[PDB]
Amino acid sequence: ETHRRVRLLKHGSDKPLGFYIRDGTSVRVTASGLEKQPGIFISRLVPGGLAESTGLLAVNDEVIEVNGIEVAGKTLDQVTDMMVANSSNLIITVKPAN
């Protein structure tokens, strides 16, 4: 599988995970062939932030699931809420851009 699971071990309750997400499009494979579908992607990393420090997350990476739950069919607002809830010990499944 091309998917990669990243665990962000945060300590500061106020300090953010260190990244931004945006709406995007993903041309995933299907039966009839490649097809476009909505998706969530990392737009950028906070300088000096936790996410950047790990070196496991990068811009354009696609968020597939948050702590075991797929983000497919959800809005940017809903996915954002899903992540801040697991800030303490967040596990994110992504699909590397590069």
């Binding site: 931004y20 997400i21 945006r22 737009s43 950028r44 992540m83 800030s87």
Partner: peptide, 6 residues
């Protein structure tokens, strides 16, 4: 682009 910080 609209982005959301986490």
């Amino acid at each position: 682009v609209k982005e959301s910080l986490v």
